[PDB]
């Protein structure tokens, strides 16, 4: 809400559209349901590529939701013609709003 960006990534091989709603939720190619669709209660940390690399990507680690166990996954936007600078757009607001929920989840 608010913190919406989108920027398509390949995840497993498959390109889709990358978007950040309070809940990282990525989608493959022609799908109406989120392929990695993770909270930011999900997210512990993530790695994105320095920006100065043809190969533009975005990981995310995993904290256990209930029901699952600790993962991480990437999304490469190699693929995606504007992977860097919307890497850095999902990067951004991603990683300042799961750190913004920790805000009111931990004392920090």
Do not use: Y
């Amino acid at each position: 809400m608010g913190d919406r960006v989108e920027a398509l990534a390949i995840f497993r091989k498959k390109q889709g559209v990358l978007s950040i709603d309070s809940r990282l939720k990525w989608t493959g190619e022609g799908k109406t349901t989120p392929s990695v669709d993770i909270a930011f209660d999900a997210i512990s940390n993530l790695q994105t590529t320095p920006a100065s690399n043809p190969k533009v990507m975005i990981r995310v680690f995993i904290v256990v939701k209930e029901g699952e166990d600790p993962t991480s996954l990437v999304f490469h936007f190699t693929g995606t013609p504007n992977a860097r600078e919307n890497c850095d757009m999902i990067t951004n607001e991603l990683r300042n709003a799961i750190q913004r929920q920790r805000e009111g989840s931990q004392s920090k």
